[PDB]
C-alpha cells in the first residue's frame, strides 16, 4: 500500500536527522489548529500520532519549543518533528495513546456508574506529577481538561497532551485571559485577570477530579456569569479580600456549602478534602502540584501491596527527579515511600 518516508529531527537528542517511514494514515482529530493523524511506523510497527499545524514563518513555533524541552513519563513524548506541505506545515510525531479521560469518564457516565476510585487516584496523581514537572520549568499548560488527558487502559498510565496553549509565565508579564475551556477555567480567568500564575492549572485539575467523582462537570454554564454562580453555590460568596487576590477590579450573597453535600454518599473524605484545597478562590491558597501528590487521598498508591483491578502492578509512581521535587524537596520524605527506598 502507500508508504511515506520523511527525514526528521529527533524530539530531544542532538540534531541527527532520521529517516522515518510510515503507512496506514487515518485521521483522528480536527480543529482550528489543524489535524492529528494516527499512523503505523514501517519498521517497528508502532503506532504514532502526527499533529499537522500551519507554520507561520514569521516566528518559531512555541508548541515545538516547549515540547522539545520536555521529558516525563506522564507527558506524551515528541519523537521527531518535520516540516512539509498540504503552504508550510509543521508535523509533530508523538506517542500514540488509545483512550482519553474524557471518553473513559463518559462511558461510565451514560451508564449511571462512576469511575472506580482507585482509577481516580491513579489518574489524578499522574496528572499532578506532570503539572509539578512542567511548572518547575515555569511552563503553564493553560488548557487542562479531560480531553487532553490520554490513557492507556491496560497500564493505567496517563499522559498529558496538547501544548498548543502552553506558555512560560514570567512574573510581571501579562497574558491573555481567554485561554482554557468552559467548565475548567479558574475564577481569576473568568474575571479577566491578566497576571494569573500556574495555579490556574491546579484549579482545572481540581475540576477534573471533582468531575470524576460526581459523574458530571461541577461548574457548568454557557457563560461566565453562569459558571460563577455555580462556583458560588459551592464555595460561597467571595470575600472582598479574595475578589482582590483574583485581581480584576456584586452577586447573590450565598454561604458556605459543606462539600460532603456536593459528593455522592460514600465518597472518601480525603477526595473531598483534596477538592476543597484545590478549588480555592485565592490562587495562592491552592495546593501546588507536588503538595497535592503528597496529599492523604493518594496514600493508597503508596502501599506496597496495591495492585490494579486487572492484577497488574501500578505504573512508575515514585521515580521522582530533583527537577520535579525542586518546588519543595522536603516532600520527598512522603512522595517516596520506604519500600521504594529499599536498595538490594
Ligand atoms: C491519540 C493522541 C492524540 C493527541 C492529540 N494531541 C493534541 O495536541 N491535540 C489532539 C486533538 C484531537 C482531536 C481534536 C483536537 C485536538 C490530540 C496526541 C497524542 C496521541 O497519542
Q: Confirm if 158 and 119 have CB atoms less than 8 A apart.
A: no
13 is in an annotated binding site: no
In a domain, 291, yes or no: yes
Which ligand 1 atom sits nearest the alpha carbon of residue 97?
Answer: 21
* Number of residues in the chain: 344
Based on the fold, state whether residues 14 and 121 are members of the same structural domain.
Answer: no
Residue 145's SS3 state is coil
DSSP 75: B
Q: Write down which residue in 49, 72, 98 finishes a domain.
A: 98
Question: Could you tell me whether strands 89-95 and 78-84 are parallel, antiparallel, or unpaired per DSSP bridges?
Answer: antiparallel
φ/ψ of residue 228, rounded to 5: -60, -40
Active site residues: 143
Q: Are residues 312 and 207 in the same domain?
A: yes
Task: Establish if 1 belongs to a structural domain.
Answer: no
298 CB-side CA count, 13 A: 26
Question: Could you tell me whether strands 18-30 and 47-54 are parallel, antiparallel, or unpaired per DSSP bridges?
Answer: unpaired
Range of the domain at 13: 6-98
Structure-block grid coordinates of residue 277? 484545597
Resolution of the experimental model in angstroms, please?
Answer: 2.7
Q: How many domains does the chain have?
A: 2
Q: Which of 13, 20, 69 is nearest to 46 (CA)?
A: 20
- 300 & 331 share domain: yes
Cα separation, 170 vs 331, in Å, equals 25
User: Could you tell me if 151 and 72 lie in one domain?
Assistant: no
> What phi, psi does 168 have (nearest 5°)?
-70, 110
Whether residues 120 and 186 share a domain: the answer is yes
Give the residue, by CA position, lying nearest to ligand 1 atom 21.
Answer: 96
Please, what sign has the CA dihedral across residues 21, 25, 31, 34? positive
Give dist(CA 294, CA 302) in Å, integer.
Answer: 10
* Residue 32 is assigned to a ligand binding site: yes
Ligand 1 centroid to 94 CA: how many Å?
9
Q: Tell me which of 98, 128, 145 is where a domain ends.
A: 98
Amino acid at each position: 500500500s502507500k508508504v511515506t518516508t520523511v527525514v526528521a529531527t529527533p524530539g530531544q537528542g542532538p540534531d541527527r536527522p532520521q529517516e522515518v517511514s510510515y503507512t496506514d494514515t487515518k485521521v483522528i482529530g480536527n480543529g482550528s489548529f489543524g489535524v492529528v493523524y494516527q499512523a503505523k511506523l514501517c519498521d517497528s510497527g508502532e503506532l504514532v500520532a502526527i499533529k499537522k499545524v500551519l507554520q507561520d514563518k514569521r516566528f518559531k513555533n512555541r508548541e515545538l519549543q516547549i515540547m522539545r524541552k520536555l521529558d516525563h513519563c506522564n507527558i506524551v513524548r515528541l519523537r521527531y518533528f518535520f516540516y512539509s506541505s498540504g503552504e508550510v506545515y509543521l508535523n509533530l510525531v508523538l506517542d500514540y495513546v488509545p483512550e482519553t479521560v474524557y471518553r473513559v469518564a463518559r462511558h461510565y457516565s451514560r451508564a449511571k456508574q462512576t469511575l472506580p476510585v482507585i482509577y481516580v487516584k491513579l489518574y489524578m496523581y499522574q496528572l499532578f506529577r506532570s503539572l509539578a514537572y512542567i511548572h518547575s520549568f515555569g511552563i503553564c499548560h493553560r488548557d487542562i481538561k479531560p480531553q487532553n488527558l490520554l490513557l492507556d487502559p491496560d497500564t493505567a498510565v496517563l499522559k498529558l497532551c496538547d501544548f498548543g496553549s502552553a506558555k512560560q509565565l514570567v512574573r510581571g508579564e501579562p497574558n491573555v485571559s481567554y485561554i482554557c475551556s468552559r467548565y475548567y477555567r479558574a475564577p481569576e480567568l473568568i474575571f479577566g485577570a491578566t497576571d494569573y500564575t500556574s495555579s490556574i492549572d491546579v484549579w482545572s485539575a481540581g475540576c477534573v477530579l471533582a468531575e470524576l467523582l460526581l459523574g458530571q462537570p461541577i461548574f457548568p454554564g454557557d457563560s461566565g456569569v453562569d459558571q460563577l454562580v455555580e462556583i458560588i453555590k459551592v464555595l460561597g460568596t467571595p470575600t472582598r479580600e479574595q475578589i482582590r487576590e483574583m485581581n480584576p477590579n456584586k452577586f447573590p450573597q450565598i454561604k458556605a456549602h459543606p462539600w460532603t453535600k456536593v459528593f455522592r454518599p460514600r465518597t472518601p473524605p480525603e477526595a473531598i478534602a483534596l477538592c476543597s484545597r484545590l478549588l480555592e478562590y485565592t490562587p495562592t491558597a491552592r495546593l501546588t502540584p507536588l503538595e497535592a501528590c503528597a496529599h492523604s487521598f493518594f496514600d493508597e498508591l503508596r502501599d506496597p501491596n496495591v495492585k490494579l483491578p486487572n492484577g497488574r502492578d501500578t505504573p512508575a509512581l515514585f521515580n521522582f527527579t530533583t527537577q520535579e521535587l525542586s518546588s519543595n524537596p522536603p516532600l520527598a520524605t512522603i512522595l517516596i515511600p520506604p519500600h521504594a527506598r529499599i536498595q538490594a
